[PDB]
Amino acid sequence: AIAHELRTPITILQGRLQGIIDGVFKPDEVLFKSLLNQVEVLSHLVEDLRTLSLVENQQLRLNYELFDFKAVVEKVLKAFEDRLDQAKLVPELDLTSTPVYCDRRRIEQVLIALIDNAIRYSHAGKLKISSEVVSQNWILKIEDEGPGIATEDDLFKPFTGLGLAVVHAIIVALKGTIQYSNQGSKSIFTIKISMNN
Amino acid sequence: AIAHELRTPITILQGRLQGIIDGVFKPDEVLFKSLLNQVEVLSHLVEDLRTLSLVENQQLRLNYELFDFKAVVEKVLKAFEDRLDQAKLVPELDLTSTPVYCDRRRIEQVLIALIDNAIRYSHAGKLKISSEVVSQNWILKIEDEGPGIATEDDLFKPFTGLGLAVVHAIIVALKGTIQYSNQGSKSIFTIKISMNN
């Protein structure tokens, strides 16, 4: 356990730094940008690891409230607008107007991670975001036109990596489940969260 | 749990990198050296975390063998010779000549961590390293002339940090215990490892 898949961005950082010292790389603005981006990758990894370790010990503080999911969707889609266009992912919204009772920032986290994975893996095309409320059950579907995964699960297994593991951990912390479907033409993530206690 | 005490060397790295981008730091050799050293600190932290997580799940592979402890002491003291002299720590050896049956690299790890903590915390003076074998029990004492710690333990608690936590975890993995004593004038770590099964 678990873990040391993050021991590689360090090493490739080390050598990179050493590459500037041994005299093979000239320190320009792009070099500093790349170093900063690698450190950001490590920060993403340690944050996701912190979240996982919080969930595994039932110490993840939850704050329930009644909120409008469409606003969170708008926020997360504007935070990814340029990257969405660079991947040619056009969001498609089928969001209900009735609010939901859940944790705002945790749902925002899972949405950020899911659309990040979509931008990084899905094919260029429509991005379906649907949210329905079916008798004290809130279903949220993320569908793409891109490819999928088929293995006897290993999807929510760990390793911006292991984001699906954090999604699954948060969904477990909430009163909900998550399922994945790969119909060849469509790849769909479904999150079912019970509202009634 | 646990953990994110390593989320700070990242941030101070980030800003540091950003400091070169915003135009407040000139990228010289000392700057690259400092960046490389910060990345090395993060590497040390992730390695110690990997070791702790291996121990906490009883997945830490052990390789027992009969070895001479004085050779390992010589190796680790030569690996720290310049830093030992820079801290004015003169090693004092009271090592027995009879070999011991244990894990070579794990004992080397705990010795590295302990003398690292000594160089970083102990006062300038004698560094007593003693090793006796008392009827199927191997006792290893590290004594300094520096200060100590007094709190109702929190010594082997985590956070080059949390090295004492790794020392304690390895000692637990081995068939041994570890105790700490602070007599004001002397600070002593004692490791008692049973040889007979």
Side-chain angles (χ1 to χ4, degrees), chain A residues 116-127:
Chain A
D116 201 333
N117 183 87
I119 295 183
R120 293 176 179 266
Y121 292 91
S122 61
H123 288 162
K126 295 135 57 63
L127 184 61

PDB file of all heavy atoms in Angstrom, chain A residues 116-127:
ATOM      1  N   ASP A 116     -13.014  16.523 -15.815  1.00  0.00           N
ATOM      2  CA  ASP A 116     -11.586  16.487 -16.102  1.00  0.00           C
ATOM      3  C   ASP A 116     -11.221  15.199 -16.831  1.00  0.00           C
ATOM      4  O   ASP A 116     -10.532  15.223 -17.858  1.00  0.00           O
ATOM      5  CB  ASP A 116     -10.799  16.619 -14.796  1.00  0.00           C
ATOM      6  CG  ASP A 116      -9.373  17.082 -15.011  1.00  0.00           C
ATOM      7  OD1 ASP A 116      -8.810  16.822 -16.095  1.00  0.00           O
ATOM      8  OD2 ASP A 116      -8.811  17.710 -14.088  1.00  0.00           O
ATOM      9  N   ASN A 117     -11.688  14.063 -16.309  1.00  0.00           N
ATOM     10  CA  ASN A 117     -11.467  12.786 -16.979  1.00  0.00           C
ATOM     11  C   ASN A 117     -12.084  12.781 -18.372  1.00  0.00           C
ATOM     12  O   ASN A 117     -11.525  12.195 -19.305  1.00  0.00           O
ATOM     13  CB  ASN A 117     -12.041  11.648 -16.135  1.00  0.00           C
ATOM     14  CG  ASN A 117     -11.788  10.283 -16.741  1.00  0.00           C
ATOM     15  OD1 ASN A 117     -10.743   9.674 -16.513  1.00  0.00           O
ATOM     16  ND2 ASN A 117     -12.749   9.790 -17.517  1.00  0.00           N
ATOM     17  N   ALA A 118     -13.238  13.429 -18.531  1.00  0.00           N
ATOM     18  CA  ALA A 118     -13.867  13.507 -19.846  1.00  0.00           C
ATOM     19  C   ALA A 118     -12.994  14.281 -20.825  1.00  0.00           C
ATOM     20  O   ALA A 118     -12.747  13.828 -21.948  1.00  0.00           O
ATOM     21  CB  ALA A 118     -15.249  14.150 -19.730  1.00  0.00           C
ATOM     22  N   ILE A 119     -12.513  15.455 -20.410  1.00  0.00           N
ATOM     23  CA  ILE A 119     -11.649  16.254 -21.273  1.00  0.00           C
ATOM     24  C   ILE A 119     -10.382  15.483 -21.621  1.00  0.00           C
ATOM     25  O   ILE A 119      -9.882  15.556 -22.751  1.00  0.00           O
ATOM     26  CB  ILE A 119     -11.330  17.606 -20.606  1.00  0.00           C
ATOM     27  CG1 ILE A 119     -12.601  18.441 -20.466  1.00  0.00           C
ATOM     28  CG2 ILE A 119     -10.287  18.373 -21.404  1.00  0.00           C
ATOM     29  CD1 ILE A 119     -12.364  19.811 -19.877  1.00  0.00           C
ATOM     30  N   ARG A 120      -9.858  14.709 -20.669  1.00  0.00           N
ATOM     31  CA  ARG A 120      -8.602  14.007 -20.897  1.00  0.00           C
ATOM     32  C   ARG A 120      -8.768  12.691 -21.651  1.00  0.00           C
ATOM     33  O   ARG A 120      -7.775  12.167 -22.167  1.00  0.00           O
ATOM     34  CB  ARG A 120      -7.898  13.746 -19.565  1.00  0.00           C
ATOM     35  CG  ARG A 120      -7.421  15.007 -18.861  1.00  0.00           C
ATOM     36  CD  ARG A 120      -6.817  14.689 -17.503  1.00  0.00           C
ATOM     37  NE  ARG A 120      -6.333  15.887 -16.822  1.00  0.00           N
ATOM     38  CZ  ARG A 120      -5.078  16.321 -16.875  1.00  0.00           C
ATOM     39  NH1 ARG A 120      -4.172  15.653 -17.577  1.00  0.00           N
ATOM     40  NH2 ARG A 120      -4.728  17.421 -16.224  1.00  0.00           N
ATOM     41  N   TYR A 121      -9.976  12.147 -21.739  1.00  0.00           N
ATOM     42  CA  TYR A 121     -10.107  10.826 -22.348  1.00  0.00           C
ATOM     43  C   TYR A 121     -11.191  10.741 -23.413  1.00  0.00           C
ATOM     44  O   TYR A 121     -11.024  10.005 -24.391  1.00  0.00           O
ATOM     45  CB  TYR A 121     -10.370   9.772 -21.260  1.00  0.00           C
ATOM     46  CG  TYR A 121      -9.196   9.539 -20.335  1.00  0.00           C
ATOM     47  CD1 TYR A 121      -9.052  10.274 -19.165  1.00  0.00           C
ATOM     48  CD2 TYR A 121      -8.233   8.584 -20.632  1.00  0.00           C
ATOM     49  CE1 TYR A 121      -7.980  10.063 -18.318  1.00  0.00           C
ATOM     50  CE2 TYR A 121      -7.157   8.367 -19.790  1.00  0.00           C
ATOM     51  CZ  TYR A 121      -7.036   9.110 -18.634  1.00  0.00           C
ATOM     52  OH  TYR A 121      -5.968   8.899 -17.791  1.00  0.00           O
ATOM     53  N   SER A 122     -12.296  11.462 -23.255  1.00  0.00           N
ATOM     54  CA  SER A 122     -13.401  11.318 -24.189  1.00  0.00           C
ATOM     55  C   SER A 122     -13.043  11.894 -25.557  1.00  0.00           C
ATOM     56  O   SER A 122     -12.147  12.730 -25.699  1.00  0.00           O
ATOM     57  CB  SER A 122     -14.655  12.006 -23.650  1.00  0.00           C
ATOM     58  OG  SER A 122     -14.434  13.391 -23.467  1.00  0.00           O
ATOM     59  N   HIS A 123     -13.763  11.427 -26.574  1.00  0.00           N
ATOM     60  CA  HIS A 123     -13.593  11.929 -27.927  1.00  0.00           C
ATOM     61  C   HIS A 123     -14.318  13.259 -28.105  1.00  0.00           C
ATOM     62  O   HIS A 123     -15.218  13.616 -27.341  1.00  0.00           O
ATOM     63  CB  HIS A 123     -14.113  10.921 -28.950  1.00  0.00           C
ATOM     64  CG  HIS A 123     -13.253   9.705 -29.092  1.00  0.00           C
ATOM     65  ND1 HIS A 123     -13.704   8.538 -29.670  1.00  0.00           N
ATOM     66  CD2 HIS A 123     -11.965   9.477 -28.741  1.00  0.00           C
ATOM     67  CE1 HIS A 123     -12.733   7.643 -29.663  1.00  0.00           C
ATOM     68  NE2 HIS A 123     -11.667   8.187 -29.104  1.00  0.00           N
ATOM     69  N   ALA A 124     -13.918  13.990 -29.140  1.00  0.00           N
ATOM     70  CA  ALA A 124     -14.550  15.263 -29.448  1.00  0.00           C
ATOM     71  C   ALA A 124     -16.003  15.046 -29.849  1.00  0.00           C
ATOM     72  O   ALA A 124     -16.302  14.242 -30.736  1.00  0.00           O
ATOM     73  CB  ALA A 124     -13.789  15.973 -30.566  1.00  0.00           C
ATOM     74  N   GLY A 125     -16.908  15.762 -29.193  1.00  0.00           N
ATOM     75  CA  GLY A 125     -18.320  15.633 -29.495  1.00  0.00           C
ATOM     76  C   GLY A 125     -19.164  16.126 -28.331  1.00  0.00           C
ATOM     77  O   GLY A 125     -18.705  16.910 -27.502  1.00  0.00           O
ATOM     78  N   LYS A 126     -20.401  15.637 -28.295  1.00  0.00           N
ATOM     79  CA  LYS A 126     -21.353  16.077 -27.286  1.00  0.00           C
ATOM     80  C   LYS A 126     -20.998  15.513 -25.915  1.00  0.00           C
ATOM     81  O   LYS A 126     -20.508  14.387 -25.794  1.00  0.00           O
ATOM     82  CB  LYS A 126     -22.768  15.654 -27.679  1.00  0.00           C
ATOM     83  CG  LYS A 126     -23.284  16.319 -28.947  1.00  0.00           C
ATOM     84  CD  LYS A 126     -23.953  15.312 -29.870  1.00  0.00           C
ATOM     85  CE  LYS A 126     -25.099  14.592 -29.179  1.00  0.00           C
ATOM     86  NZ  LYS A 126     -26.184  15.529 -28.782  1.00  0.00           N
ATOM     87  N   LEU A 127     -21.248  16.309 -24.879  1.00  0.00           N
ATOM     88  CA  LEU A 127     -21.032  15.914 -23.487  1.00  0.00           C
ATOM     89  C   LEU A 127     -22.366  16.064 -22.760  1.00  0.00           C
ATOM     90  O   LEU A 127     -22.775  17.180 -22.421  1.00  0.00           O
ATOM     91  CB  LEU A 127     -19.938  16.757 -22.838  1.00  0.00           C
ATOM     92  CG  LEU A 127     -19.543  16.388 -21.406  1.00  0.00           C
ATOM     93  CD1 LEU A 127     -19.011  14.965 -21.346  1.00  0.00           C
ATOM     94  CD2 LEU A 127     -18.521  17.369 -20.855  1.00  0.00           C
TER      95      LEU A 127
END
